[PDB]
Amino acid sequence: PWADIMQGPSESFVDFANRLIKAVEGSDLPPSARAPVIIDCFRQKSQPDIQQLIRTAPSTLTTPGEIIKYVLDRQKTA
Amino acid sequence: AWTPLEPKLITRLADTVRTKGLRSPITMAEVEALMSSPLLPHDVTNLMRVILGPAPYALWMDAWGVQLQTVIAAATRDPRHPANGQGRGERTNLNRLKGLADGMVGNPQGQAALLRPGELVAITASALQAFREVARLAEPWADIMQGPSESFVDFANRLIKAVEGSDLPPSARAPVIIDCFRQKSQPDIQQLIRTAPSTLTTPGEIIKYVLDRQKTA
Amino acid sequence: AWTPLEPKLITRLADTVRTKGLRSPITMAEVEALMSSPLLPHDVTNLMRVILGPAPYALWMDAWGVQLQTVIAAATRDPRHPANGQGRGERTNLNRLKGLADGMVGNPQGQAALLRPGELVAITASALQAFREVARLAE
Amino acid sequence: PWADIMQGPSESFVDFANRLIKAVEGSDLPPSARAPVIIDCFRQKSQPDIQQLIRTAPSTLTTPGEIIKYVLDRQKTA
Amino acid sequence: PWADIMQGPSESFVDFANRLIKAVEGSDLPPSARAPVIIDCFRQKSQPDIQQLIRTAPSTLTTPGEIIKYVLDRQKTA
Amino acid sequence: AWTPLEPKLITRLADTVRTKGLRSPITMAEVEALMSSPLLPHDVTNLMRVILGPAPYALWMDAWGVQLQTVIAAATRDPRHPANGQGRGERTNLNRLKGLADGMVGNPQGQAALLRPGELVAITASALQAFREVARLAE
Amino acid sequence: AWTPLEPKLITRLADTVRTKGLRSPITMAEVEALMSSPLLPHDVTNLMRVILGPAPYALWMDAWGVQLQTVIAAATRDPRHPANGQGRGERTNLNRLKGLADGMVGNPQGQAALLRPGELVAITASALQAFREVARLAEPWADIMQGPSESFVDFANRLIKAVEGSDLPPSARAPVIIDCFRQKSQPDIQQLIRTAPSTLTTPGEIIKYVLDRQKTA
Amino acid sequence: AWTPLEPKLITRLADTVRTKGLRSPITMAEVEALMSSPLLPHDVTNLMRVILGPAPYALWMDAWGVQLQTVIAAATRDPRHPANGQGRGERTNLNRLKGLADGMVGNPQGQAALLRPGELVAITASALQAFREVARLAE
Amino acid sequence: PWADIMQGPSESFVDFANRLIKAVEGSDLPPSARAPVIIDCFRQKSQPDIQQLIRTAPSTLTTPGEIIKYVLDRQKTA
């Protein structure tokens, strides 16, 4: 179930994005509703450090690929 | 034909002024509401007589006279005033604005007969500005800080209220509001505004940006 | 001839916005109600000045300007706008939409004189969309 | 009676001004004699602290509203 | 001697002004030097309460009579 | 005439990407190998759909679009692009590069019909650079 | 012909910056002194290399580039720039302003040959503004109060300095300075300004009035 | 051709003003010394910016403006001013005296080009009188 | 040697930046390789608090001056 996917405390972001995109594209949603759902799940899941990282984006991110690129650039190396 | 304002609305407005005061934004909104249609000098005079106490009413008469005098100076500085006419015989004297001219003293019907719509709207705007002055006088922007637990829209409301209801010129309010958003508004929002990829040049734009990217908590 | 909106309706709408908020469906229905007849820029401006607080009013001025600019771009993209005319002398500038043009600044009577009904309905729809944006943004 | 109105030792100045203007305007005086009477009652009533505050006015106050504004500005906060 | 005249701690201002104008006009000064001397003696003599009262004059006082009138208006009744 | 790439080679390349990763020099060599003949937008799109996971595929779509936009800017900066023609009627739009133009959407045969060899090589180089960017970004 | 600045003056200025800091008014006065004649990019670059440390020098290079870019935007917005010419062949590129153009890299003589006097004065003003920015950054107007023992001219100097060397628009400095004179400047001077029989509408007029009627002590 | 004043002399004068004050006869003598050759508005403005503090500089700007206005009143009262010309096209506006006219704002070279020697000496005398007023006022 | 410069546990950031820029500009590197090296040394040296402060930069910092300004703004006052 896509709506139950959370980014674990120790999980990296690319694994979380892979799992989420997999569960969203392999589901019962229409094809035209996958990108907005993936974006809004990146924003509300993806534990509050990345949540604030996406929130304070000086540019407007309108695609899952752009969000992934931005987060991978500005992520907290740890 | 002259129609008086409802005494029910006037009683409700008087009780609003009695409980909330002269300077509350709800009171100014209510006054703007009852200041919607262009009023005759009789209407505004009786309205301020009823809603204001004796001393605020004296202050308001003074301020209204001063603002009307500024209006008449601008009118003699421009013959195209909506209260004026093209020839010199339509020049508007302060006796006609304050309702003191011939055929108007104490008679609202004759008042409504001889007055122009431009005259009415000028009188109304003058009375509103005078009310604002007296309200600011009867009861500090640079001391306003966003509390640790306060939301941002409340802080913005309080700050814009205190800046617009102050002694600053009209052309100095927006830069002051912006620079107070930037230096007040505790360091999380300070850094949020600082790291703005776009340049924000208006209080509304700053408010929109902060409301978009604020830390939901 | 210009007729102002009742201050009683405006007071009731202001108290509705004060208790229910900006985003409640009852509030949007009430705004749609008071947005029924095409309003002059003076009317909508004073209405938003009274019902909205200072910061939402700033946000609404911004959003209204942006929406009016989109309207003017669509207008220069189509000479058959109900606000435009056929010749180039009837092209509608933003000073005429925001009420800033000559013969309109501060005077609602002259405003109602020079404005077109298409101008009025475009201004009204723009203001409604801006109100929706600000309401979605404030909370 | 307007000529019997004094500012009480504990009364504020706006209350005293309200009471005095009420009693003077709701009396038998001609309309052209109310402002001078209100001014001269502000000067002689309104207990000696405010009396001296009005006396030492570098500007000449020629209106009840101006006197009220001046006194409200320079009054002893207490 | 005019330059030795001070306003006593208990003396009123009209007595001090009388004494000073008497001693200045009944002295060896030229006639065109009496008014400036009287003014500058009002400003530097006339114990610091009246000194500050004259200093903080929103208008410019350019005559002994005007200074006397101003001080008599705004003096501390005591 | 359009001929598809072998699913055996594509399966081997997908397993190479799965075990070695996106950034290994052997993987880039294999991609260069399968990027030898000029591919149609359909071919490269399906290839990246199969060999890349969902999130790297989104990143790659973004990067490919950006690189194609740079190519189209250079093309409008020089009318002698091997994708362009001499007259203005041969100017190449991004709908024709991404395979979105008329007569191309979903049809590889029509795609191969209308596309130019310069168009194909530009699309291919753009896709290779985008793959390099995404590989450098993913790990 | 290019003449270098004296290393004695440069050494004295460097020691001034070392002891007094970047933001002291004496340091800014000394910089204005050594910024009197229009300098070539070589001169200003070496001057900032010598007087500033490494990190302030990096900051200053950044700020100088930004200010020069604003200048070049204004130049492309007006073909009558004293650095520009009338035809398009005299348009001034940033390589010519930063000294990076052909025939100028590392050579001050050729630099002085090809550069215009308008170019020199624009570069100089840009460098001065960049120095001001970096000095304000390396080490707030709304926090300035007149101390209990401080004189009024010192308070006015400090306040005008902090207001003009800040992020406010140019059209918002005078009203802010006035309203800060009125609300800061401890209550004796506050009441002195409040009871002004005339209306003071300029910081200079307020300063003159207060200096006239101040309590000598 | 414009030549700037030595920063060494300006530094010495600034330290003189710092130690002796504004009103000492030695300070006024030094100012008269550095006020010997007719200065352009740029020179006097920067000189007062450097030697005077912020508040005395504001006072001096005010006083300089007032004195220049008196000069311009005397100039419109006499068409034979060494700053004026014979025809009406040489009448000197305050924008030309304060250095605000066209071709002068921020550029000392153009300033020195368009200005008259009578203009320069009038500006200089005005600035000296303004300095005297401010010095008498500050202490 | 520039590649041996670390920000000490007690050292401030402006001193570290001064030392690093000095050692990088006074070295054998080409002029076109100093800014990237200074940036990448700010990112990998400059003990992990400032490392994470630079990592989680919502904007992309592409100049040593911009990095210095950002760090000076958001640094932990201590």
CSV table of C-alpha atoms in Angstrom, one decimal, chain G residues 22-23 56 59-61 63-64 124-138:
chain,number,residue,atom,x,y,z
G,22,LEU,CA,36.6,47.7,9.0
G,23,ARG,CA,33.6,49.6,10.2
G,56,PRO,CA,37.3,39.6,3.8
G,59,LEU,CA,33.8,38.6,0.3
G,60,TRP,CA,34.9,41.8,-1.3
G,61,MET,CA,35.7,40.2,-4.6
G,63,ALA,CA,30.5,42.1,-3.6
G,64,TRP,CA,32.5,44.0,-6.2
G,124,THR,CA,35.8,53.2,-8.0
G,125,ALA,CA,32.2,53.8,-6.7
G,126,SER,CA,31.4,50.1,-7.2
G,127,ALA,CA,34.5,49.2,-5.1
G,128,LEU,CA,33.6,51.6,-2.4
G,129,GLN,CA,30.0,50.3,-2.1
G,130,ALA,CA,31.4,46.7,-2.0
G,131,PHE,CA,33.8,47.7,0.8
G,132,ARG,CA,30.9,49.1,2.7
G,133,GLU,CA,28.8,45.9,2.3
G,134,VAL,CA,31.7,43.7,3.3
G,135,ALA,CA,32.5,45.9,6.3
G,136,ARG,CA,28.8,45.7,7.4
G,137,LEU,CA,28.9,42.0,6.9
G,138,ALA,CA,32.2,41.0,8.6
